[PDB]
Write a protein that binds this ligand. Structure first.
Ligand SMILES: *[C@@H]1O[C@H](CO)[C@@H](O[C@@H]2O[C@H](CO)[C@@H](O[C@@H]3O[C@H](CO[C@H]4O[C@H](CO)[C@@H](O)[C@H](O)[C@@H]4O)[C@@H](O)[C@H](O[C@H]4O[C@H](CO)[C@@H](O)[C@H](O)[C@@H]4O)[C@@H]3O)[C@H](O)[C@H]2NC(C)=O)[C@H](O)[C@H]1NC(C)=O
Ligand SMILES: *[C@@H]1O[C@H](CO)[C@@H](O[C@@H]2O[C@H](CO)[C@@H](O)[C@H](O)[C@H]2NC(C)=O)[C@H](O)[C@H]1NC(C)=O
Ligand SMILES: *[C@@H]1O[C@H](CO)[C@@H](O)[C@H](O)[C@H]1NC(C)=O
Ligand SMILES: *[C@@H]1O[C@H](CO)[C@@H](O)[C@H](O)[C@H]1NC(C)=O
Ligand SMILES: *[C@@H]1O[C@H](CO)[C@@H](O)[C@H](O)[C@H]1NC(C)=O
Ligand SMILES: *[C@@H]1O[C@H](CO)[C@@H](O)[C@H](O)[C@H]1NC(C)=O
Lengths: 422, 210, 152, 51
């Protein structure tokens, strides 16, 4: 076949360069067009637009401007207010809606034509709950930033009803990243085991104020819910004796993955440097890694379907598209080895609930992988206690002191009883 | 004992829940002694109708198989839930089905029947009755159902006179390995072979009278 | 040609109408709770439902007047943690024992849930339900022993 | 004793953590006293226990 066109709805950065998800959408179309062996006699074209990420009326116009011009798929406005408005357009027209960002699915929607490549927090909240039991905790101090983070972690708030924990849920200030009045009350409470449900732009901002206070010590543990923990500048915190455990779905131990990331930062020549950000470099964050995987999983679906002609559907006279119900069945049944590992979608939902995580943690050489989470397996946190330096203290103390002792009355005799003793 | 169609056949007396399939009543115990009729056993082939109060760990209403006599017998798992269980061969010739029950239930119950024919690749019977009778350890070498130095399962059977009750007292009691309830013990079952009626089990130096 | 939009009154549908009413200038009158995101620059809307940044203080006042030291907040859908977030955050400052539970799925069977509550000795319960759901709970708290003189 | 000029005194401060040495007297100039505290903060030694 020919042109087949993809749609896009992305950030309108008024001053600076194009967005990180919008580069990774153009980088993935150019990769599949150049490397011929995926879609050999089929090319791709993009139709990206700009919204304000909060006006659902603007995201609804730019969807119907792409539906009238004709696309094959919408690749997500990537915000909870505006993705829900484009999700219902894509349902009523037939076209799929691929989205690379977490969104509260209201439990009574009848939306069928969407997949979400972000790791679903119904699966992730088990992964944190496996960590807070692997470290044998009894008190946690879950800290979020916005009110929707209670939905992101509701399998962790519902933990003391069945397990032995003590949740002490707190909230960060509004935007206002000076969270020192919050961190001061966490010191008075002796709250040493903390879970942050915040993005890495804010997770690199609390640690400047957990260091300005006396909270980056050997007593404090920190679990982060974000998957961009590897993209933090951790040089000030590497020697503190802290613990910073987290996850990483970005498959950075593969040669094929790391070469694209080196080709990514080559394409990030328009990088704004910020020394006060607390972030390392223009790494491919996991919100831009999933947009790279969003194009390829749909590219598996167009490979198995050389009958697809893009129509020109309206919105005021909406009709289900002729090939929408079959092409959506191919996306939900497609497997791919992307930069985030194994992509497979849940047939009931369209949500990634089966995925491979890597438990990274902070040691004195930087962030290091110490385990692996998997929904079928659980924690495979090996860690072995072999590869460590010397000088551990051990006490033999064989104070059993085996006495040889016969029975001979009055000296030694069995105690008279009915129960068994030992 | 209000458990129903439990009445056994040549093998596999179909071993269903009490008042199946109406509903099983509150607190019950029924022990369901799977005879595993000789040269054969019973495989618990559960029917489709199966639902008994699903909970965490099945600390509430549940079901067991417990390959072995009782107690230390390795459970496969607890069996509460809405899906019918499977994977039973139950190679032991002596079995048991614990069906516990809480006070506040629903979920009519269960039913399962035999599927095990083949053969694996003692009869110390002591029938007696009367006003009294002295069962001793002297007969177990004299009745010639045993051999010196081999595993015995010799069970004494006590029948009362009609309208009477039984009081076991110990005139002598001596174990060669005291406080070791694995290799030598005397248990007292009050009726059939069930842990529902097990008054005491002695392997220490002194056995109190039951 | 209208002068006011009186709202579909649902979380996914009111946000779609709110941004239309902002862009066109017409006021959007909302009569049911709907969590707006913290940085939505919308101005042409009013809401007459009592805000849960006030109703979650009235519940928290009522558990301090009753001198409780243990609650068992029970909600039904995942949005109910936002409706009560000033009550979940309460043991961080006071001395409560928030144990958050959830009702089951699309079914209306609180028989497994209410049994685990009486085994845990949970006699002070906050139900975050509708009045249709609270009618079903109170019938299923009468068929069990959940209706003595010392449940609240 | 601090290292020679070489203001990276983290091997010194690491051995002061193992010894539980919370009460410290520095006989150094303020150009070096402002340099040890960058490395007493890069390690976990600017806390409520250390004087
Ligand atoms: C997406 O698709 C998945 C499967 O394809 C559907 O299933 C959900 O995901 C997992 C998979 O099982 C469930 O979470 C796990 O449940 C295990 C037990 O499940 C049973 O629990 C009781 C048993 O009495 C039943 O009432 C219940 O109905 C289930 O039958 C738990 O064991 C898991 O905990 C931990 O256990 C193992 C043990 O080794 C550990 O190794 C792991 O670390 C693991 O964390 C875990 O809780 C989940 O409950 C399933 N259901 C739902 C509703 O999420 C999904 O339905 C489908 N959709 C979504 C949105 O996920
Ligand atoms: C948590 O932090 C501690 C340091 O406070 C880490 O322990 C050190 O690292 C290695 C383990 O690979 C040991 O050889 C060191 O001797 C440890 N230091 C001390 C003082 O014992 C630990 O690895 C961290 N754990 C996690 C899960 O992040
Ligand atoms: C294209 O991708 C394939 C993956 O199977 C692999 O051969 C290689 O990464 C690329 N080949 C070329 C010629 O670019
Ligand atoms: C390339 O085009 C031919 C028609 O000339 C078609 O048969 C084939 O399927 C296309 N794709 C390949 C070879 O991958
Ligand atoms: C865990 O990882 C090891 C290798 O590190 C592997 O051999 C093993 O099969 C994995 N799974 C489990 C359950 O141990
Ligand atoms: C028990 O008593 C009856 C009369 O009451 C008597 O006939 C019988 O012989 C007694 N039992 C024995 C074993 O002697």
């Amino acid at each position: 076949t020919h042109v087949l066109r993809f749609g896009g709805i992305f950030e309108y950065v008024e001053s600076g360069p194009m967005g990180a998800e919008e580069l990774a959408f153009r980088f993935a179309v150019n990769t599949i067009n150049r490397n011929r062996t995926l879609l050999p006699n089929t090319t791709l074209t993009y139709d990206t637009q700009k919204i304000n990420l909060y006006d659902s009326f603007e995201a609804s116009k730019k969807a119907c401007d792409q539906l009238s011009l004709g696309v094959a798929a919408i690749f997500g406005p990537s915000h909870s207010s505006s993705a829900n408005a484009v999700q219902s357009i894509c349902n009523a027209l037939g076209v799929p809606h691929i989205q690379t960002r977490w969104k509260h699915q209201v439990s009574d929607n009848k939306d069928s034509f969407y997949v979400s490549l972000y790791p679903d927090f119904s699966s992730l909240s088990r992964a944190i709950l496996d960590l807070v039991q692997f470290f044998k905790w009894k008190t946690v101090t879950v800290v979020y930033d916005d009110s929707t983070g209670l939905i992101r972690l509701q399998e962790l708030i519902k933990a003391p009803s069945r397990y032995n924990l003590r949740l002490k849920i707190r909230q960060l200030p509004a935007d206002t990243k000076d969270a020192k009045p919050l961190l001061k009350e966490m010191k008075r409470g002796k709250e040493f085991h903390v879970i942050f449900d915040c993005s890495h732009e804010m997770a690199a901002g609390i640690l400047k104020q957990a260091l300005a206070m006396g909270m980056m010590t050997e007593y404090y543990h920190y679990i982060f819910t974000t998957l961009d923990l590897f993209a933090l500048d951790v040089e000030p915190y590497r020697y503190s004796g802290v613990n910073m455990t987290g996850f990483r779905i970005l498959n950075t131990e593969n040669t094929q993955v790391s070469s694209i990331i080196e080709k990514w930062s080559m394409e990030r020549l328009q990088a704004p440097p910020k020394p006060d950000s607390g972030l390392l470099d223009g790494f491919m964050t996991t919100d831009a890694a999933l947009m790279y995987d969003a194009v390829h999983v749909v590219s598996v679906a167009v490979q198995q379907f050389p009958q697809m002609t893009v129509s020109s559907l309206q919105c005021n006279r909406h009709k289900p598209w002729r090939f929408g119900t079959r092409f959506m069945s191919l996306i939900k049944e497609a497997h791919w080895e992307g930069l985030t590992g194994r992509i497979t979608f849940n047939k009931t939902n369209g949500l990634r609930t089966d995925f491979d995580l890597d438990v990274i943690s902070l040691k004195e050489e930087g962030l290091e992988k110490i385990g692996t989470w998997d929904p079928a397996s659980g924690l495979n946190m090996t860690e072995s206690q072999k590869g460590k330096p010397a000088n551990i203290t051990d006490s033999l103390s064989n104070r059993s002191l085996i006495v040889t002792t016969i029975l001979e009355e009055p000296y030694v005799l069995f105690k008279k009883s009915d129960k068994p003793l030992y | 004992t209000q458990c129903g169609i439990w009445v056994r056949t040549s093998n596999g007396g179909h071993f269903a829940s009490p008042n199946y399939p109406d509903s099983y009543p509150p607190n019950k115990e029924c022990i369901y002694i799977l005879e595993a009729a000789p040269r054969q056993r019973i495989e618990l082939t559960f029917d489709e109708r199966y639902y008994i109060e699903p909970s965490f760990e099945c600390r509430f209403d549940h079901l067991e198989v417990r390959d072995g006599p009782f107690g230390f017998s390795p459970l496969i798992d607890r069996y509460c839930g809405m899906k019918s269980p499977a994977l039973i061969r139950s190679t032991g010739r002596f079995m048991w089905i614990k069906f516990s029950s809480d006070e506040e239930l629903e979920g009519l119950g269960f039913r399962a029947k035999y599927s095990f024919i083949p053969d694996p690749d003692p009869d110390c019977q002591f029938e007696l009755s009367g006003a009294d009778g002295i069962v001793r350890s002297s007969q177990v070498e004299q009745e010639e159902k045993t051999k010196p130095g081999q595993a015995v399962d010799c069970i004494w059977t006590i029948k009362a006179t009609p309208k009477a009750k039984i009081y076991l007292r110990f005139l002598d009691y001596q174990m060669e390995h005291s406080n070791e309830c694995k290799r030598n013990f005397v248990a007292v079952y009050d009726g059939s072979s069930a842990i529902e009626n097990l008054k005491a089990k002695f392997c220490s130096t002194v056995a109190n009278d039951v």
